[model samples]
Target: HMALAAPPGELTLALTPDDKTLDPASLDRALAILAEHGILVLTGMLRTRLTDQLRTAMLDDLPEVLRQQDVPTNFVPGHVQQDPPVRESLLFPDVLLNPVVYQITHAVLGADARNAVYSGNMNLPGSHEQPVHLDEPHLWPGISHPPYCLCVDVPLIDFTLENGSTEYWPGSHVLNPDECYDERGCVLPAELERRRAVAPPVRFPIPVGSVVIRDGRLWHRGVPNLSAAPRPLLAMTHYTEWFDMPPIQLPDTVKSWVDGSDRHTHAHFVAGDVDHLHPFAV
Candidate 1:
């Protein structure tokens, strides 16, 4: 039997194998849901064995190593926003470059979808919740945009409220703002209060081995971590290629492999020294 996890009218699409491969209708339904809900959740699609190594190599080693590099390892308080160079094993086709993810992204972004940003967030114990924000601020001042970019959130472990699972304001992407952002590019307090007045936010404890694909324009934030252990999650952003945001430079080793396939031809290249490297240079 096909399983359903979401509440009614949430527009969650189902995926199941007719045999060893998925039927075209399975993919069609997923695409339909993307257009309707602005978010999608695929459960048990990733192998935990692969994610475990990513957890140890990237997440566990990151806090100490990046701190030594004087980068402080966090973009927000009590969170490690990025990772150090990971083992080549974790960069396999099934990892960040997974084909199915691109299939979904290519449809949403149309000709504008490109993949490059490979990052993660680790919420350490006692993290203060982040203010609600959208990754790409609205392009038009008052016009709502379609899903032009998406973040594929892969949990390294089961996400729980106590461990700071991300909280989302469902259906919030449809709302438009006349003037809501501030100097820091975060949502202004008055704007946040205005938005929350109409909708209540909710957190879903996404199980490990599952993936949550969300519109980068959606309203969300990292909640507080009351658990003793740190919670790490992979945040790989696939963007609309039309955006002027420069892609993160890939290592030569990965560049050689990714260039070997036309599938990854959309990856952008740039030149710079380590000291000059900057993430999300628009």
Candidate 2:
């Protein structure tokens, strides 16, 4: 889920609809919620009643993809060490273009939408959270005032504490880079201390069939999966117009969209979005 790193003159909050996703009216309300907390969840954004075939194909292909990656047979590694490791690929395959999710993401990101994700992810149960970190803090330390919507996170499963739901300290995204952040560029210790000094973060568990959008520079971590049942989840991060998107010449399923997509996400062939115009309006 996206959290705002409240800056000196800013505030960040989380918005969540009680339903799976928002309709036009609900979408309006959902956006208002975004303006309120800087965080919002549109429930049921993607879990359409499936045609059994899509389900079967997703199940069959996901395991095959992970296995070929030679990743651990049980679970896989994720980015951002400070948060608990969660997932994003197994449950939702056609995530980027899920009509409802896409539309809402479009509205939230606005016309200047430069980036959208097409990645596979899964979060297994029984995982511990790593320390805190930014999605790419080291790469972009100058990102104090992010130019675009910055990030998007959708949970394929319920973001309950039992599962490794993502957790964030509200407003930490705006920490003064010079005053906070460690040499390695992590804001964990200071953030944790700041959080403890204030109030504990709302465990912020999101139900299934929901999408959480936030600023990428916001500080967050994976919550531990304490449940015996694996709460494998999938997630993708995207920034508007900041980077180049690569599309490899291949079939729809196995094509590479982002140039350096990790082996896991790029396992499929892709014709890529050849028209190659900007995907967002801003």
Candidate 3:
């Protein structure tokens, strides 16, 4: 028999050269794809030079971060939660307060959508697949509602199957969390099997300088990394104006950057450095 192709719905859009935001038509298309598919890919949102700098910085800092006494490794073997440097140089608007990102988030979540979480996930060589899961549970156990939260993921390096691109089950955002999760809040195996028959999971090998915006409630998992080097994917979560979320701890130096952006950053500025390596409750 011939090999089956992956299921559809991994939609992607691209920005033209020197453009800072999506045009009206493109914005509407991105919003529609996100609402129906629970994920959207936007290319050319970031410059290759910036991504290269981010990759270099992360690689340089990984050794020190791994040696930290309290670094977390509980997600899966060889997979660790990492946080990109919160310095001014790295907190550019294109990556953090991106206009295209905010436009879509504002439309889907609310006009007052705000940044809540800024972190990253590092998949090391030989890492195992994580249990399929959702970033956050549904607001009401039995009800389905519009998305209240969105995750913006930026892969510093080009993602490939060998380097552990994330696997996603499109349209799974509408699945009732009450029925799909166990007492431990993990996605039940039975739910996975049921979803497989209806909508098979897919891994999109996205390139660097592309951003992935996904609903927080979508079912997804991290795949094993077979490449020699570590793969880093920066993650930021944005919530609706009404969601009760604690402020993200940020360095005071970046205060101006956040203030300049249109989107509200629910941030708690501190005098010293923020402990980015430690995993916070997401």
Candidate 4:
């Protein structure tokens, strides 16, 4: 058990207008946006310095782009969005040393939480375009977690609407567990949310260092990339203490450097954070 985490508010006075010029009223307006849509995007804030650190952590030893797998025709309708065998990062930058990001994750998902799973999605010009599906239920096949988990996603590249950072059916996350979703008509929850849910998604163009906190069940897709180079990320996941996650294989270069117990969680981040070790392993 742990302290009752605050609701994105009470988490800090530092978030006040002084640190950011947005008035209290505007801040409430922004919080309203997240509550209404089950997604939050904040500017002028860097939760962790890890974005730069993550780039540095993998730029040198990143594994060769992974193999390409065809996008299931049912997942993405019309055409492809990425290249064959999309290259993706197997390890996200570690969270232990980056407490700001880590704590926010804990506070969001509640204590003793370990993420369900995290897999980076890379899309190259005209390739691997993913179909719109909710990440949560898609994993286990039929089990939906409702609102128990959350994800913190940050793009290492400039992810734009055209570049396909990800597109969502806003407010879809709020529809209770029974409402089924299909490409054509998703039975929605609330009347107001139904309206917001039906419109074209607000194209999310995330900056290199910004973050997006989203409910795990939201309907979304990684749009096709038209950009010349690949678009990547340090995808992070957070779940309640109830989840079980297995080991994610680390690059050999990273494996030789690990120094921790609890091997599953330990090995996962170790590949990317080994150099930051201080006084000792955590």
Candidate 5:
């Protein structure tokens, strides 16, 4: 198995060298680091203009059909305007078609590795910390399987601990899964305690315009936002071909933007709007 703990230097890669040059070697290096750590941080890119647009797209009012449960009573105390792609206006192909991102994902998931579950999470100020958890459980208990899904996070603003940045447990992806995960894939109290003793959780204060690539099985949580403003982060799930998760349809206007890439193959599209609540409702 690859070593679980990553060297401090491997945790952060400055995008300054690669952003403009877009070197294949830079991408390979990033993928190699991800292979070892199961997470990566890239900075010095994703400037204000694009991030502003993404923030606007991500924070727009929910369609009449996709309103969320009250934050006070919901499992996650925040507003997550789910499935931005369904809006069609914000489904920018270039963001998903990013060559470097594609290279990193394709290395592990193959040319067929697909994109799914495009949504945003905005942890409102005063929200409580969420339970440290894994987004997906291992296929069966005990064995640590190879990763089939990669979560890509694009933070719209600087992510600070005061503003509810994501807190993750590095190297926890190597832990064996068990009945403790239950159906929702959340960690049992005992397991969370056990893992915390070993790995411990740490918050990553990622600057605006950077992207975070993390293993789906890594233990992490959304923390409380003490700052006055909401902390919103956009998420895109890239999966291996073997996974059969449901896909959401995009407007033809959006679909037209998906040409020549595997975006469509990874996403399931439909004739019109879908139950935006359908994903979390499941």
Candidate 6:
């Protein structure tokens, strides 16, 4: 049985015991949906125990992270961007180098797709909605090209409307940012109004243990979390090999674990502790 309903423009696949590697036919289908709608979810891709442990650890560390003088917030209040613990115990292959996720990303971006970011965002209870925006702008102002980047989001807990699931505008990836955004990268009010008439946004209550891969240029935003508990969504950005971006910093302890053959993590391994909490500290 399907754990959650997949709305239009979104596709979901479950992994069976035989799915050591995803079937080639199913991979094609997933690529088709992603190319058209810009999003795809693979269910049963993560272990419940691992997800639970991540959530618990984040919760335990939340207070200290929030206590910092100036924590990074997304466009709105109550939504914070923070890095997950970089310890080896939590850096499991299933979560970071997920095979199914790799297949789709490699096909879309290229075989050399490398992970550039390993951070997350949390929607705290009573959070306000963020202005709709894209994680990155179109590479060319007037042209639509193949995706240069994809964001893999892993929810630590079951995402629900009450707890603030992200809202997405399907098929909006083709809209050139130059026409829709102003000099400051803000979505123009007139452009937003016009686009809304053609296609309203939709939200999916994503389940835990599922992996959502989306185009980085898709229009989306974080909404209010009405529930008392905070919602943490771990994020990783995989970019095409030719795309130039800063590499993620990780402790040397996990060097052996992250260096994979199919994809490069683009990680700068440090000898000792990584200041994940204060990412921008001098």
RMSD of each: 4.7, 9.2, 2.6, 10.3, 4.4, 3.2
Candidate 6 lDDT over residue span 187-245, tens digit each: 67777778889877788788888888889888888899999999998899899888888
Off by over 4 Å in 6: 1-10, 16-18, 183-185, 278-282
lDDT of 4: 0.47
Model 2 weakest lDDT span, ten residues long: 273-282
Displacement of the residue 254 alpha carbon in candidate 5, Å = 2.7
> If both were scored by TM-score, which would come out higher, candidate 2 or candidate 3?
3
Off by over 4 Å in 2: 1-36, 48-94, 98-110, 138-144, 147-150, 179-185, 245-282
lDDT tens digits, residue span 1-282, model 4: 011212233212233111323455655654455456667654334434545655544432233323224342324442222211102242333432233444444445555555434444445566555544565543332353346566666666666755656666666665544345443333333532444546534455566655566776666666677767656655555666666545443444444323332212323433332221000000
Clashes of each: 1, 50, 0, 11, 2, 0
Poorly placed runs, candidate 3 (over 4 Å): 1-10, 279-282
Model 6: which ten-residue window has the lowest total lDDT?
1-10
In Å, residue 74's CA in model 6 sits off its true spot by 0.5
lDDT of 1 at 245: 55
Of the pair 3 and 4, which is ahead by TM-score?
Answer: 3
- Ordered from best to worst lDDT, the candidate numbers read 3, 6, 5, 1, 4, 2
- Worst lDDT 10-window in candidate 1: 273-282
TM-score of 4: 0.58
**Which residue runs of candidate 1 sit more than 4 Å off their true CA positions?**
1-22, 63-66, 69-76, 84-86, 265-282
TM-score, candidate 2, is 0.60
Give the Å shift of residue 124 in candidate 5: 1.1
Sequence-dependent TM-score of model 5: 0.84
- Report the error of model 1 at residue 262, Å: 3.9
Query: How high is the lDDT of residue 196 in model 5?
Result: 72
The residue-level lDDT of candidate 1 at 113 comes to: 71
Residue-pair clashes, model 2: 50
**Candidate 6: deviation at residue 10, Å?**
4.8
User: What does the lDDT read for residue 92 in candidate 5?
Assistant: 58
Residue 56 displacement in candidate 1 (angstroms): 0.8
In the predicted model 1, the residue pairs found to clash are 112-241
lDDT-better candidate, 1 vs 4:
1
